[PDB]
């Protein structure tokens, strides 16, 4: 799953933004104060391209 997500982030992320694509392999999750936030509630970093991951 991880290696897959990384090959997608690198391939398509450019459309979202030149600085907004970082390398990530595994879901990065942040929740510390309002200086680091990750969620669809509030965020300050996320996926640059539209991606949801579905696991059973």
């Amino acid at each position: 799953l991880s290696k897959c997500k990384s090959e997608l982030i690198d391939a398509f992320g450019f459309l979202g933004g030149n600085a907004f694509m970082k390398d990530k392999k595994g879901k990065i999750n942040k929740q510390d104060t309002s200086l680091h936030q990750y969620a669809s509630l509030v965020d300050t970093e996320y996926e640059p391209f539209v991606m949801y991951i579905i696991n059973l």
Binding site: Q31, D32, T33, S34, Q37, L41
Partner: protein
């Protein structure tokens, strides 16, 4: 003085205690937590600190009164219960022993609690060497005096509560709630002083030792305030343990405790103490905690000492009280009252 001794056991016990201090709430964090009013926001901020992990473990769309206790109770399991497994020697028995002094007051409240018919899951967080998953439950449900003695014997080392439960049978601590608690508080301090005696010749105590005096007068003064504007019994011990009888006297403690608003003896006694004769109960409370807070902090950077660990154990009780007290206020969308002062102390 200290550190003249070579100890493998102390090595671990000191490092682990120091490990917790490091993740602990700073000044900046306290300022940040007071501000809040959103339930979700509190969660986010708290997460950075050592206590913050427990919040993260299970989260909800609404913070409850129930959740806040459960996080703090979980943290005690890590800080206190776990460390004893990885320790042995004289170092372990000290971790056991200071917890047993807390245990004395806590179980007696549990026993009384059974009579009123409070539940065992309705007992709120407090330091112990076994949490609520073993020893505390067995004691709680039993109401008979005999069965309490048997439960203390399983533990190693034997807890003072054997002596205390024998006393209250013969009615040497009386019937009422008040009277028993006050005498048991003196018992707490009596055992604390004895644990200091055994441990002192190899690691020398400085900050702890001054703190053990300051706690003695301080405790007698907290009971004296509590039973003021109520009733106090003169032959009964409710004047508590004091370091010296020329520092403050039993007599002055007992007058102060009797209902006449005779605060002036406290004020005369207090010449560099932060408590002084005041009729404001709340102002005194702020002052007893700040005072209690100091001499703990100097220890935290003092190291390879049994002294350090003692001051931390009482400091964790004060940290739990403060964290839960700030957290609770924001839950129920209130701004800190007396709480504001004791955040930074």
């Amino acid at each position: 003085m200290e550190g003249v001794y070579f100890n493998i056991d102390n090595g671990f016990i000191e490092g682990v205690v120091r490990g917790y201090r490091n993740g602990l709430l700073s000044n900046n964090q306290y300022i940040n937590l007071t501000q809040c009013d959103t339930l979700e926001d509190l969660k986010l901020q708290l997460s950075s600190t050592d206590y913050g992990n427990f919040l993260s473990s299970v989260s909800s769309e609404s913070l409850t009164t129930s959740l806040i206790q459960e996080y703090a109770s979980s943290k005690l399991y890590h800080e206190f219960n776990y460390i004893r497994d990885q320790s042995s020697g004289s170092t372990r028995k000290f971790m056991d022993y200071i917890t047993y002094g807390y245990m004395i007051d806590n179980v007696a409240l549990m026993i009384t609690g059974t009579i009123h018919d409070r539940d065992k899951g309705e007992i709120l967080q407090r330091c112990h060497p076994l949490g609520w998953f073993d020893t505390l439950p067995t004691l709680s449900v039993a109401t008979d005096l005999e069965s309490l003695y048997e439960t203390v014997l399983v533990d190693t080392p034997l807890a003072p509560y054997f002596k205390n439960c024998f006393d209250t049978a013969e009615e040497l601590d009386d019937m009422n709630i008040e009277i028993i608690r006050n005498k048991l508080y003196k018992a707490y301090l009596e055992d604390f002083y004895n644990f200091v005696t055994e441990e002192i010749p190899e690691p020398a105590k400085e900050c702890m030792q001054t703190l053990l005096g300051f706690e003695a007068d301080r405790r007698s003064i907290n009971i004296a305030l509590n039973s003021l504007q109520s009733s106090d019994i003169d032959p009964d011990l409710k004047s508590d343990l004091l370091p010296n009888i020329g520092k403050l006297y039993p007599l002055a403690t007992f007058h102060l405790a009797q209902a006449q608003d005779f605060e002036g003896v406290r004020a005369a006694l207090a010449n560099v103490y932060e408590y002084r004769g005041f009729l404001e109960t709340g102002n005194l409370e702020d002052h007893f905690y700040q005072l209690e807070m100091e001499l703990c902090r100097d220890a935290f950077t003092q190291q390879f000492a049994i002294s350090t660990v003692w001051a931390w154990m009482k400091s964790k009780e004060q940290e739990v009280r403060n964290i839960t007290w700030i957290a609770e206020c924001i839950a129920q969308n209130q701004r800190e009252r007396i709480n504001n002062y004791i955040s930074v102390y």
